[PDB]
Amino acid sequence: APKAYGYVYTADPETLDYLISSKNSTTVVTSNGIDGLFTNDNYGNLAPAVAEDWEVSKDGLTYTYKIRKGVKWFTSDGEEYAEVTAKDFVNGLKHAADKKSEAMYLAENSVKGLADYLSGTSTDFSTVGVKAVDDYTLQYTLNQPEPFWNSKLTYSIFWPLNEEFETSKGSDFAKPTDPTSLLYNGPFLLKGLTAKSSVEFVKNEQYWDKENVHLDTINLAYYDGSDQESLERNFTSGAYSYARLYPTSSNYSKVAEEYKDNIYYTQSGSGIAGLGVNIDRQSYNYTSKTTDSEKVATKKALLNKDFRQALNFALDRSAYSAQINGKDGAALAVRNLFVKPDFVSAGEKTFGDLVAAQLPAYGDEWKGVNLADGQDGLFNADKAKAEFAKAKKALEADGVQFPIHLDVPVDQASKNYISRIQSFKQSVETVLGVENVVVDIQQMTSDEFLNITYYAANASSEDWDVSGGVSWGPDYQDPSTYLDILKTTSSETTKTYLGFDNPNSPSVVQVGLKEYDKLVDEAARETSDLNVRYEKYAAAQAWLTDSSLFIPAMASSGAAPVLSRIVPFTGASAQTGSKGSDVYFKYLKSQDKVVTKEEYEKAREKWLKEKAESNEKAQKELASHVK
């Protein structure tokens, strides 16, 4: 039935603790059940959720939220527990601080006093700038004005948590197979968790905003990538409400004929997929290298910027994207920049434009660069070979023997991840020569792969030389959400994308990341002129692009052919945060029949007009909240 949403999830959560986790697998299982102060409506506006109203001081430092009365916490079986209050947001942030949240970067330099509490120089949380002035008045005090502060409040570190419940559960709190170990205040109740099988929700029939909830049930089935045709097959049977299509499937010509009037393409998402370079590899439990000399050679090569540039310029991103999208749709998903090029603009210039204007200082090879989505602006075999020749001269003078062996891990279950990594291998080896670079693909089980990538505990666990296993999506509406996480001090995220968690590692200094820190920090200090702030963050992105420490390849979502029974443009629209329709299913409506491309385009053209007007009205209302 249309009120029974069915689709898939790709990884079992390590935790249900939404305050501590920075991983989408926790968002997938909690957002539908946990509301914070705002959501996102179908036009992308912030919509009142637990905050019924808000104000900001004239100096921009104090935000005050009127907590909606009558919003309740419920158990997984629908029993009322307590009333959501401002004290739950004080407790949420204290819990995030005390248990060292993986997402603390969003809050630690923003909320007054929080950095001192995290370091231990203050142990009294009353010195931290979150206060329950009364049970329905929540006040945050910031270190500096942040026009993007409210956009942070759709991210999970600012969600509420009832302290009495948390204390009552002890070490059983937020356990990943136990829906009774959280309480729910959102549009759905988390009902079922079965490892490698399902995530299950039911509509919260006592939800204050249930008039905006149009699904009775949500069921997500585990999908490990071993059968990419499974999505379309289960869509056709009616089990799934949606299906991402893979044109490389052997049955695709049949699918494309049957659904010729229904397949449509989604817009590219804001997250970035690509290949991180481990500049400080600690462990060799997944390697093809046979000698310590090869290990030393690879470590030295990965510290060489020209070597990394050679890999970056040798990667054919269209062919990489074609492994999941086919050749005809391949270019749509290509991305050339860590920050999505139009994520922000300074007047008429996109962020990508600002980066392109600063990149040529690093070399004439960047003059004329096209950083726009939807085309491969970085692939250039001639430039790849030229950079490699410089690297090889420098490395051979230091005793390094060639070829350089690169370990890239894959989950043996995900066929089209293997195909993507094989395309990387073919690109690099054909352009640069197998006498120069050998890509050694390390096959392992799904759990083994997660343990050295997505769920790696520390830098010692990042057992790889190059890896495309983990993407990054933006958490709030400012370039810092992409660029701050690669600073030398951002150890929770530097391990994932760059292999290090020691801010003082000599590998980190050798690749110049201290200069990156200073560029990011100079941008962060600009709070009086957004255009200048964005120009300064573009300087940091230009450094990152030249450094080739992360090899961008594609948007991490979107730019894909899909089938749908979801009524077009009814779901939440979010470019950042945890309340987009990928994870949060308020507002969404389903229909009986498969959506047609004509239905979708008609809705899109009306939505674009309505969104522009709605966003403009919202912007004009901002000043009325200044008190």
Numbering used by the authors: 33 to 659
What does the study report here?
Given the auxotrophic nature of pneumococci for certain amino acids, the Ami ABC transporter system, orchestrating oligopeptide uptake, becomes indispensable in host compartments lacking amino acids. The system comprises five exposed Oligopeptide Binding Proteins (OBPs) and four proteins building the ABC transporter channel. Crucially, SBPs determine the specificity of their respective transport systems, thereby governing the range of molecules capable of entering the cell. The five lipoproteins exhibit pairwise sequence identity of ~52–60% and share a very similar overall folding.
Considering the precedent of this observation in previous reports for AmiA and the identification of the peptide’s nature, we modeled this decapeptide reasonably matching the observed experimental map. The three-dimensional structures of AmiA and AliB revealed the capture of oligopeptides during their expression and purification from E. coli. Surprisingly, our analysis identified a total of 356 distinct peptides bound to the AmiA protein and 393 peptides bound to AliB. Notably, AmiA exhibits a stronger propensity to accommodate a negatively-charged residue, such as D or E, at this ligand position, a trend also observed for AmiA’s ligand positions 4 and 5.
